[PDB]
Nucleic acid binder design. Structure first.
Ligand SMILES: [Mg+2]
Ligand SMILES: [Mg+2]
Ligand SMILES: [Mg+2]
Ligand SMILES: [Mg+2]
Ligand SMILES: [Mg+2]
Ligand SMILES: [Mg+2]
Ligand SMILES: [Mg+2]
Ligand SMILES: [Mg+2]
Ligand SMILES: [Mg+2]
Ligand SMILES: [Mg+2]
Ligand SMILES: [Mg+2]
Ligand SMILES: [Mg+2]
Ligand SMILES: [Mg+2]
Ligand SMILES: [Mg+2]
Ligand SMILES: [Mg+2]
Ligand SMILES: [Mg+2]
Ligand SMILES: [Mg+2]
Ligand SMILES: [Mg+2]
Ligand SMILES: [Mg+2]
Ligand SMILES: [Mg+2]
Ligand SMILES: [Mg+2]
Ligand SMILES: [Mg+2]
Ligand SMILES: [Mg+2]
Ligand SMILES: [Mg+2]
Ligand SMILES: [Mg+2]
Ligand SMILES: [Mg+2]
Ligand SMILES: [Mg+2]
Ligand SMILES: [Mg+2]
Ligand SMILES: [Mg+2]
Ligand SMILES: [Mg+2]
Ligand SMILES: [Mg+2]
Ligand SMILES: [Mg+2]
Ligand SMILES: [Mg+2]
Ligand SMILES: [Mg+2]
Ligand SMILES: [Mg+2]
Ligand SMILES: [Mg+2]
Ligand SMILES: [Mg+2]
Ligand SMILES: [Mg+2]
Ligand SMILES: [Mg+2]
Ligand SMILES: [Mg+2]
Ligand SMILES: [Mg+2]
Ligand SMILES: [Mg+2]
Ligand SMILES: [Mg+2]
Ligand SMILES: [Mg+2]
Ligand SMILES: [Mg+2]
Ligand SMILES: [Mg+2]
Ligand SMILES: [Mg+2]
Ligand SMILES: [Mg+2]
Ligand SMILES: [Mg+2]
Ligand SMILES: [Mg+2]
Ligand SMILES: [Mg+2]
Ligand SMILES: [Mg+2]
Ligand SMILES: [Mg+2]
Ligand SMILES: [Mg+2]
Ligand SMILES: [Mg+2]
Ligand SMILES: [Mg+2]
Ligand SMILES: [Mg+2]
Ligand SMILES: [Mg+2]
Ligand SMILES: [Mg+2]
Ligand SMILES: [Mg+2]
Ligand SMILES: [Mg+2]
Ligand SMILES: [Mg+2]
Ligand SMILES: [Mg+2]
Ligand SMILES: [Mg+2]
Ligand SMILES: [Mg+2]
Ligand SMILES: [Mg+2]
Ligand SMILES: [Mg+2]
Ligand SMILES: [Mg+2]
Ligand SMILES: [Mg+2]
Ligand SMILES: [Mg+2]
Ligand SMILES: [Mg+2]
Ligand SMILES: [Mg+2]
Ligand SMILES: [Mg+2]
Ligand SMILES: [Mg+2]
Ligand SMILES: [Mg+2]
Ligand SMILES: [Mg+2]
Ligand SMILES: [Mg+2]
Ligand SMILES: [Mg+2]
Ligand SMILES: [Mg+2]
Ligand SMILES: [Mg+2]
Ligand SMILES: [Mg+2]
Ligand SMILES: [Mg+2]
Ligand SMILES: [Mg+2]
Ligand SMILES: [Mg+2]
Ligand SMILES: [Mg+2]
Ligand SMILES: [Mg+2]
Ligand SMILES: [Mg+2]
Ligand SMILES: [Mg+2]
Ligand SMILES: [Mg+2]
Ligand SMILES: [Mg+2]
Ligand SMILES: [Mg+2]
Ligand SMILES: [Mg+2]
Ligand SMILES: [Mg+2]
Ligand SMILES: [Mg+2]
Ligand SMILES: [Mg+2]
Ligand SMILES: [Mg+2]
Ligand SMILES: [Mg+2]
Ligand SMILES: [Mg+2]
Ligand SMILES: [Mg+2]
Ligand SMILES: [Mg+2]
Ligand SMILES: [Mg+2]
Ligand SMILES: [Mg+2]
Ligand SMILES: [Mg+2]
Ligand SMILES: [Mg+2]
Ligand SMILES: [Mg+2]
Ligand SMILES: [Mg+2]
Ligand SMILES: [Mg+2]
Ligand SMILES: [Mg+2]
Ligand SMILES: [Mg+2]
Ligand SMILES: [Mg+2]
Ligand SMILES: [Mg+2]
Lengths: 58, 49, 185, 222, 159, 51, 148
RNA sequence: AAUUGUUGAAAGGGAAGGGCAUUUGAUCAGACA
RNA sequence: AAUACUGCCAGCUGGGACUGAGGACUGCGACGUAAGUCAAGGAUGCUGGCAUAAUGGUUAUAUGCCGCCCGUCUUGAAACACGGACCAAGGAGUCUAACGUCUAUGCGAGUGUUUGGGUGUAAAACCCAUACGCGUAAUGAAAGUGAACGUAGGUUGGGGCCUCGCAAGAGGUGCACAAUCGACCGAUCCUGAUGUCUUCGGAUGGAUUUGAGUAAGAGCAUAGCUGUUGGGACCCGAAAGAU
RNA sequence: AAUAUGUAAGAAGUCCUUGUUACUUAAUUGAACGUGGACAUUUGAAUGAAGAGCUUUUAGUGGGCCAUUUUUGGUAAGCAG
């Protein structure tokens, strides 16, 4: 009892039903996988300029 | 018989359980019977409490 | 024969009247369709919908989430509006005055509101006071504070609470949950 | 309470001014039209006179009707038929001619017949089977006030203001042409003329660009 | 059995260009990449370390990370019926700056000028791009240019 | 409640397009155009009748 | 009730909604948690990662109760005082007279410090405090009195 | 009910039964006022 | 000069067919000096026949054309694939324990009277003390420890509302929700202050690590469709095995 | 080459001014994130848009077969892929 082995027949039919959704885009993406030494210092950078701006409404 | 995202259950029903089911149909019965039992003990027991 | 571009005979998928059967609910719904049809004020259209929302989508607004809203700049005399029940919160020690209009106030929060000198309005008294919703501040409760949403989207590396009955170690915490028992998630 | 004839008067007078603007407008197009045509006729003459050859501008407007039914169509022409709003057999829309859409017409020649509409057939298309998309709701054009309400934004306050915007490919041909629902034509009333339809016009079938022969086709389908 | 190794099928994909083998020229390492740059991926067969997978060949993406010898490029590969986000760690030899944005930039600065100079003149701008319109009318001259009449030619063989 | 085609309904033909009366009244549909007489250059006639 | 059940609706169609190809046989996957390491492993890892194998220590004859120690935060705390009595002490916060709260009498075992209580002195009797809980009490002028 | 006898009506050139339609025969509702 | 051919006319005009939806008025117009009139947001006028089996419904037959046995499994059944001679009456997704999502309802940082007691017109209804269960804390194998730098943070989008403006629009505030960077609690790894029964103690500040966490609670309970597991488990079916 | 295929066509934009840091430079150098300021719908191609986005749960299915074109094995097949 052999039977069929493989086909991509009808698979693009299915994939197009509910879409092929575009990849979605966000302002402010994630820092995931960014260099750690950069992020460490950059954590302190935002902290600093955060503090300066509360000192701008003191 | 494993499918879907369901919590794994532990329903111990693999013995002949249907043999040992206790329905408290006599719940109202035995309360009536317990109340009368005390009303007799009250009267047997003289003024004792 | 037409080559259709969209599903045919598709319901809008938004509720139309509350699924509830409460007479009084249908009366408020009656009031507010009228208001929403003849007022051009947005607040009525919003309120009309919230009356349809199912109990999930009506998370309680705490009395303290309200007190917070009144601390917004220029928001402290606004009359907050909650289309749902309002719950008491023993964790704020000072509550402001103001006027809260809700579907329900719990025994606890109605006290805390009235005690501090406020007023508890039912949503139709609110209609009379503010047909265009003038000076209203609508608050919604937190919807995904629901417990069940912890288990939604469960899957590898999703960090997402297994549907479990009993918990503790001995309960889905070995193979596939730690580097030393096979793998981790 | 007045209004009775008071605001009847405010309106009926201003409804008389609108037809006034329309009459003086429709009169103008007419001058434009025939002088445009006479000018070209004299361009060609004055060229043979001057021992030379006058080549007209390539057409910029085209009218496309779906010839082919609904089923067994490959995905790419099938999208382009949807984008061209020809989703059923024998309906038809106007198309502005540019590189970016001349390449659309190419992709669907096996399924459509198109060509160059004359003022007469644009006129008799809008008048007889011209409808408007107004909150969808395919609305029959029947009164000039229907148009101005939805296209008055861009000029265009008469049914002929439309036809003028269409036939000349005006600045607002996109909004004017899209305001028109696809035209629903019947089968050609004298038949197709060819034995088999789904060959090119050049090969003795019906599809492709048959140029100004589209008018005899369309006029029978209207 | 079948074979499906990491560089399977890349015989010509990772070949070197004709008479262009050897060391990579020194500008490849003088180019500078910043977060947000649009880059094109083309693997260099001679540099095995830090090489993209054959799938990301010919593929364009955006850098999200800048390391010592490398750039992090996120790319949207579409698996199934959706796109996923893929971050790649390439070395500077396999990446290159995409001119796919130059036309845009060249058109932005130009658009500002066309707008400032027109505004400071008296409006009337029109600075969207339009497709190719059909040709206009024209009168072609016969002078010095009489039509040379042609006919089809008969059949021959010449073999 | 019933689309009346112009083209064959004068009443509605005049509800749209009030110029219809001008146009009918001045024939216009059969306008006799100007009689001129420019004849073609012989270059044109030669190459036409050529082979 | 049975009148709303979908099987009333399935009457008259051959298969009861269970498919003509695929049928509704007895147990196709096997009964119960059968094959969670085999034909059902895709569903066990994800939905149930961590299911197989051991972790930590055994503990013979553990009596929960030994570990009875409900927790209460400064968060609440003032709630252990009846509400009428409550406002009396919130005002007139002093030494000399400051409420005693027997948090074990309320059935709590430890006080944590979830956050911020008014600056009223409170005398807190409890079995266990957290460093913060205990510090935050003092900043209000209260003390913690270790009990048992 | 399957199935059977009698009576009455009707059709039948290697099955019967069915669809749309109408002639003919039988039968019947309603509506007029 | 004419004609053909091709195209146009908001030029005129005859014959034929099908339809007549709507039910006061309301609209856009047209003709008129005017009053009025109209073919202008869907049929009216005039005349006749029968008032009946005339028309219509049913039915049986004839005639034109058309129509293979249903059920099933199957890529494919009218099949030279299986079940079915006929009729009646039985005849198959149930109930339970424990659950997922959703929904309605009660009450809400709580909630759940019904093991029990009280009581009764007595398996009902009405009432209720102490507990208990789940929820209100997490995290470690564990010993243990245990959630505010700050208006409970910053940024960006947010309905709604507030202010200006006739309006178009501008500013203000912005719950829910989404994205992002931080802060807090535990695990892990560093750091190791003041002290000390000299080895106890672990403050403080940190780290591409990690948790089903904190960051002004959302839960508990009853019900119901669907879905899940154990049960004879939709109904009927072994060859066997045991006492 | 043809046909297929990656990315781009702006408000999440562009330009000036000059803050934050422990990263980085010989260096207030740069990198990253910002405060403040300048320019609106011809704001940056076309066509379409009975709207767009999102969430939860669950059925059936998991023997397929045919046609044009491309194509492997076989002399071939109403063959096998
Ligand atoms: Mg097999
Ligand atoms: Mg086979
Ligand atoms: Mg298979
Ligand atoms: Mg699944
Ligand atoms: Mg049991
Ligand atoms: Mg068993
Ligand atoms: Mg037993
Ligand atoms: Mg018994
Ligand atoms: Mg008894
Ligand atoms: Mg809802
Ligand atoms: Mg909400
Ligand atoms: Mg929680
Ligand atoms: Mg859930
Ligand atoms: Mg657990
Ligand atoms: Mg178009
Ligand atoms: Mg072409
Ligand atoms: Mg004819
Ligand atoms: Mg004919
Ligand atoms: Mg024909
Ligand atoms: Mg033929
Ligand atoms: Mg016709
Ligand atoms: Mg191989
Ligand atoms: Mg190769
Ligand atoms: Mg190596
Ligand atoms: Mg029932
Ligand atoms: Mg029913
Ligand atoms: Mg059904
Ligand atoms: Mg049925
Ligand atoms: Mg089913
Ligand atoms: Mg099936
Ligand atoms: Mg079956
Ligand atoms: Mg099958
Ligand atoms: Mg599996
Ligand atoms: Mg186990
Ligand atoms: Mg052990
Ligand atoms: Mg132990
Ligand atoms: Mg602490
Ligand atoms: Mg015979
Ligand atoms: Mg019949
Ligand atoms: Mg009468
Ligand atoms: Mg002619
Ligand atoms: Mg004519
Ligand atoms: Mg009528
Ligand atoms: Mg009628
Ligand atoms: Mg007049
Ligand atoms: Mg009339
Ligand atoms: Mg009669
Ligand atoms: Mg009679
Ligand atoms: Mg009759
Ligand atoms: Mg009668
Ligand atoms: Mg008669
Ligand atoms: Mg009759
Ligand atoms: Mg008979
Ligand atoms: Mg018959
Ligand atoms: Mg036949
Ligand atoms: Mg049958
Ligand atoms: Mg078979
Ligand atoms: Mg099948
Ligand atoms: Mg077959
Ligand atoms: Mg069959
Ligand atoms: Mg056979
Ligand atoms: Mg069989
Ligand atoms: Mg048989
Ligand atoms: Mg059965
Ligand atoms: Mg059931
Ligand atoms: Mg509720
Ligand atoms: Mg509590
Ligand atoms: Mg009871
Ligand atoms: Mg009683
Ligand atoms: Mg009794
Ligand atoms: Mg009582
Ligand atoms: Mg007691
Ligand atoms: Mg309790
Ligand atoms: Mg507990
Ligand atoms: Mg929990
Ligand atoms: Mg708490
Ligand atoms: Mg914790
Ligand atoms: Mg613990
Ligand atoms: Mg310790
Ligand atoms: Mg800190
Ligand atoms: Mg600190
Ligand atoms: Mg920032
Ligand atoms: Mg705003
Ligand atoms: Mg803001
Ligand atoms: Mg930490
Ligand atoms: Mg750890
Ligand atoms: Mg550990
Ligand atoms: Mg937990
Ligand atoms: Mg909570
Ligand atoms: Mg809830
Ligand atoms: Mg459901
Ligand atoms: Mg089952
Ligand atoms: Mg058996
Ligand atoms: Mg047996
Ligand atoms: Mg036996
Ligand atoms: Mg055996
Ligand atoms: Mg024996
Ligand atoms: Mg080529
Ligand atoms: Mg493309
Ligand atoms: Mg500084
Ligand atoms: Mg700014
Ligand atoms: Mg566009
Ligand atoms: Mg285009
Ligand atoms: Mg459009
Ligand atoms: Mg829409
Ligand atoms: Mg599914
Ligand atoms: Mg398989
Ligand atoms: Mg499956
Ligand atoms: Mg199968
Ligand atoms: Mg081939
Ligand atoms: Mg084959």
């Amino acid at each position: 009892a052999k039977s069929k082995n493989h086909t991509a027949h009808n698979q693009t039919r299915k994939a197009h039903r509910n879409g092929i959704k575009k990849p979605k885009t966000y302002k402010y993406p994630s820092l995931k996988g960014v260099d750690p030494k950069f992020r460490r210092n950059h954590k302190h950078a935002l902290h600093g300029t955060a503090k300066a701006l509360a000192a701008a409404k003191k | 018989a494993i499918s879907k995202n369901l919590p794994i259950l532990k329903n111990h029903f693999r013995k002949h359980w249907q043999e040992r089911v206790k329905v408290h149909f006599d719940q109202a019965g035995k309360k009536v019977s317990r109340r009368n039992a005390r009303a007799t003990r009250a009267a047997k027991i003289a003024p004792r409490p | 024969g037409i080559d259709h571009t969209s599903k045919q005979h598709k319901r809008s998928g938004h509720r139309t009247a509350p699924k509830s059967d409460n007479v009084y609910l249908k009366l408020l719904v009656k009031l507010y369709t009228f208001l929403a049809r003849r007022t051009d004020a947005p607040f009525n259209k919003v309120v009309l919908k919230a009356l349809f929302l199912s109990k999930i989508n009506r998370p309680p607004v705490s009395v303290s989430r309200i007190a917070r809203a009144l601390k917004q700049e220029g928001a402290a005399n606004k009359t907050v509006v909650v289309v749902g029940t309002v719950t008491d919160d023993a964790r704020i020690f000072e509550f402001p005055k103001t006027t809260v209009a809700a579907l329900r106030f719990t025994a606890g929060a109605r006290a805390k509101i009235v005690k501090a000198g406020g007023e508890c309005i039912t949503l139709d008294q609110l209609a009379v006071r503010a047909p265009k919703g003038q000076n209203t501040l609508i608050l919604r409760g937190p919807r995904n504070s629901r417990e069940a949403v912890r288990h939604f989207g469960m899957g590898p590396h999703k960090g997402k609470a297994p549907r479990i009955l009993s918990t503790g170690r001995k309960f889905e915490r070995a193979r596939g949950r730690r580097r030393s028992k096979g793998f981790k998630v | 309470a007045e209004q009775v004839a008071a605001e009847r008067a405010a309106r009926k007078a201003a409804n008389k001014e609108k037809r006034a603007i329309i009459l003086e407008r429709n009169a103008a197009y007419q001058k434009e039209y025939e002088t445009a045509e006479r000018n070209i006729i004299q361009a060609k003459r004055d060229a043979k006179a001057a021992g030379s050859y006058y080549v007209e501008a390539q057409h910029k407007l085209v009218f496309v009707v779906r010839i082919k039914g609904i089923n067994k169509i490959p995905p790419k022409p099938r999208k382009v038929l949807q984008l061209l709003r020809l989703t059923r057999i024998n309906s038809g829309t106007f198309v502005k001619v540019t590189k970016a859409t001349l390449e659309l017409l190419k992709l669907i020649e096996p399924y459509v017949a198109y060509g160059y509409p004359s003022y007469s057939t644009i006129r008799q298309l809008v008048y007889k089977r011209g409808f408007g998309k107004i909150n969808k709701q395919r609305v029959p054009l029947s009164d000039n006030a229907i148009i101005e309400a939805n296209l008055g934004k861009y000029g265009i306050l008469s049914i002929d203001d439309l036809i003028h915007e269409i036939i000349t490919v005006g600045p607002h041909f996109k909004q004017a042409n899209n305001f028109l629902w696809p035209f629903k034509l019947s089968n050609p009333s004298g038949g197709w003329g060819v034995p088999r339809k789904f060959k090119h016009f050049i090969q003795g079938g019906s599809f492709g660009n048959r140029e100004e022969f589209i008018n005899k086709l369309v006029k029978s389908m209207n | 059995g079948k074979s499906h190794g990491y560089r399977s099928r890349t015989r010509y994909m990772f070949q070197r260009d004709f008479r262009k083998h050897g060391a990579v020229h020194l500008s490849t390492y003088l180019k500078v990449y910043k977060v947000g740059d649009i880059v094109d991926i083309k693997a260099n067969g001679s540099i095995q370390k830090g090489m993209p997978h054959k799938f990301y060949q010919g593929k364009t993406g955006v850098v999200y990370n800048v390391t010592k010898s490398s750039v992090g490029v996120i790319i949207n590969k579409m698996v199934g019926n959706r796109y996923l986000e893929k971050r790649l760690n390439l070395r500077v030899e396999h990446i290159k700056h995409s001119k796919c944005r130059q036309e845009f930039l060249e058109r932005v600065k130009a658009n500002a000028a066309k707008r400032a100079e027109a505004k400071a003149q008296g409006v009337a701008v029109q600075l969207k791009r339009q497709p190719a319109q059909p040709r206009e009318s024209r009168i072609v001259s016969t002078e010095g240019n009489v039509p040379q009449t042609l006919a089809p030619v008969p059949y021959e063989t010449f073999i | 409640v019933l689309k009346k085609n112009p083209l064959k309904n004068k009443q509605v033909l005049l509800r749209l397009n009030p110029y219809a009366k001008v146009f009918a009244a001045e024939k216009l549909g059969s306008k006799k155009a100007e009689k001129t007489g420019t004849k073609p250059a012989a270059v044109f006639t030669e190459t036409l009748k050529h082979d | 009730p049975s009148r709303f059940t979908k099987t009333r609706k399935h009457r008259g169609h051959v298969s009861a909604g269970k498919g003509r190809i695929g049928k509704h046989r007895k147990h196709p996957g096997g009964r119960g948690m059968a094959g969670g390491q085999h034909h059902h492993r895709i569903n066990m890892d994800k939905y149930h990662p961590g299911y197989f194998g051991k972790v930590g220590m055994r503990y013979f004859h553990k009596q929960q109760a030994h570990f009875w120690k409900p927790v209460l935060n400064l968060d609440k705390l003032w709630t252990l005082i009846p509400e009428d009595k409550r406002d009396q002490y919130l005002k007139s916060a002093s030494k000399e007279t400051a409420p005693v709260i027997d948090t074990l009498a309320a059935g709590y075992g430890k006080i944590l410090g979830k956050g911020r209580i008014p600056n009223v002195p409170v005398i807190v009797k409890a079995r266990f405090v957290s460093k913060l809980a205990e510090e935050k009490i003092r900043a209000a002028g209260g003390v913690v009195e270790l009990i048992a």
